[PDB]
């Protein structure tokens, strides 16, 4: 496990929402990787990768306010401009084998409507 290698997947897959393309996002992901948001859980990579994919709609401009990076886990805060306004929320990222093993997603209350609304909708 390298550092500087581990702040790269994380901060590239962070970023590529308002840029890049969707769908992109898949091959950082090793196959059973989950995504947890409260009491939601998403599985596979194709779940993870669509809810990503669903979320880049509420993102008009991402950014990476700032970076831990503990052992094989990854604690990022970032920040999203969607229509004016700003948000913040956590990924924290335990990363296993070069591949992400498991994503943990913290957000704002107000969006927690949203993040429910795009687990019924997947």
């Given at each position: 496990?390298?550092?500087?290698?581990?702040?790269?997947?994380?901060?590239?897959?962070?970023?590529?929402?308002?840029?890049?393309?969707?769908?992109?996002?898949?091959?950082?992901?090793?196959?059973?990787?989950?995504?947890?948001?409260?009491?939601?859980?998403?599985?596979?990579?194709?779940?993870?990768?669509?809810?990503w994919?669903m979320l880049t709609?509420?993102?008009?401009?991402?950014?990476?306010?700032?970076?831990?990076?503990?052992?094989?886990?990854?604690?990022?805060?970032?920040?999203?401009?969607?229509?004016?306004?700003?948000?913040?929320?956590?990924?924290?990222?335990?990363?296993?084998?070069?591949?992400?093993?498991?994503?943990?997603?913290?957000?704002?209350?107000?969006?927690?409507?949203?993040?429910?609304?795009?687990?019924?909708?997947?």
């Amino acid at each position: 496990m390298s550092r500087e290698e581990i702040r790269k997947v994380v901060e590239e897959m962070v970023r590529k929402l308002k840029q890049g393309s969707p769908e992109d996002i898949s091959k950082y992901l090793s196959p059973d990787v989950r995504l947890e948001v409260g009491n939601y859980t998403f599985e596979g990579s194709e779940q993870v990768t669509k809810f990503w994919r669903m979320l880049t709609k509420f993102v008009d401009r991402v950014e990476v306010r700032k970076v831990q990076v503990d052992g094989n886990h990854v604690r990022v805060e970032v920040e999203v401009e969607w229509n004016g306004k700003k948000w913040t929320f956590e990924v924290e990222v335990e990363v296993r084998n070069g591949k992400i093993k498991r994503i943990r997603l913290q957000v704002d209350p107000e969006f927690k409507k949203v993040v429910q609304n795009i687990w019924n909708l997947l």
